[PDB]
Amino acid sequence: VVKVRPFDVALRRFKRSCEKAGILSEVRRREHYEKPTTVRKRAKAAAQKRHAKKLARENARLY
Amino acid sequence: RKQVADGVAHIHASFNNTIVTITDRQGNALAWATAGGSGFRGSRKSTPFAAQVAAERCAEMAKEYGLKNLEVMVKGPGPGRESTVRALNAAGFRITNIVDATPIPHNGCRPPKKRRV
Amino acid sequence: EIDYKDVATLKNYITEAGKIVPSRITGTSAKYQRQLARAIKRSRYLALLPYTDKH
Amino acid sequence: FKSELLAKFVNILMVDGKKSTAEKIVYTALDAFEEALENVRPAVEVKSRRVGGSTYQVPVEVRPVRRNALAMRWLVEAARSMAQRLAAEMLDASENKGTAVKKREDVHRMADANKAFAHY
């Protein structure tokens, strides 16, 4: 929700007011049924990648 | 025609088409226009620009009722979200409020199966 | 010490949409976050908070 | 005349190294441009992309140099005596008629029809 208080701002403010309610995110989640197993598999690989990043990104000479 | 000045634009941006239904504030329809009735078909319906035209076509049919101020209720994930709203500003209409009206179930019905395309 | 009646506090932990805010954002302790979420949800049932911005 | 666009025009008219034959033709029919060019110069053209797995005709700007060059090419190609065909075109080109002007039109037509692909 954005009360137009110029329009160009208001539509950008709108576009960021709906990012933040994860609206488009949510529609794309609920377009097709994610089977619960697949949901978890994604979530593990997410966590696993996130860690395996940070770990080696603390191990982060080059030249 | 009952002349109305304050109204509501309901943008329905599917991934396929985009519909624009300009109503009074009581949600009685006055005008409607659709990307896939405003010329474009198949691929090109699902573009911002087709939806823009829908909005334009609807706008210049909403002036019969003499509308001036609209609130924009943008409902869905489609390409014709932003473009329709621009096409209402750049068609005179003062936009008061830009609501998102996308239906979000609070876990509800099992969506259709995934496309093994 | 979270009450389903203390709307004012609870409102610091809901978004404009009405959504419960992550504990990551707010910085709440897991234990507190759990108790918020419970309170917020009791508030919502007493229509002291809203479930959704729409309604 | 001491103009690089004129140089271009003849070289775009020139065939098989024959600059003289060309130069004569253009110089003579000029005795009988900068306007008639500017009424053929196209601002917009369709290109084509492999979009993911199809071929879509996507509108793009013509940059000013290609603008003058595409015009010359279109004049000559329509135009193609020659001096009794190269003022013929390049006067109807100041009177928004012919085939070099039809190009500017039928190009813009194609782009107008493909605005739905403009920026995507």
Q: Do B86 and A1 touch (CB under 8 A)?
A: no
Q: What is the resolution of this structure in A?
A: 2.8
CA D113 to CA B43: how far, in whole Å?
13
CA C19 to CA C40: how far, in whole Å?
10
Beta strand B69-74 pairing with B6-13: parallel
Q: Is B72 helix (H, G, I), strand (E, B) or coil?
A: strand
Contacts of B49 in chain D (CB under 8 A): 115-116, 118
**Residue B82 carries which side chain, given as an amino acid letter?**
E
Residue of chain B whose alpha carbon sits nearest to that of A21: B100
CA B112 to CA B3: how far, in whole Å?
43
The coordinates were experimentally obtained by cryo-EM
Q: Which of B56, B54, B36 is nearest to B46 (CA)?
A: B36
B61's enclosing H/E stretch is helix B48-62
Q: Do C15 and A17 touch (CB under 8 A)?
A: no
Contact D60, D45 (CB under 8 A): yes
B19's enclosing H/E stretch is strand B18-24
Non-local CB neighbours of B20 within 8 Å, separated by 6+ positions: B9, B10, B11, B12, B32, B33, B34, B51, B54, B55, B58, B84
Going by the DSSP 8-state scheme, the letter that residue D20 receives in this structure is H
* Residue D64: how many other CB atoms lie within 10 Å: 10
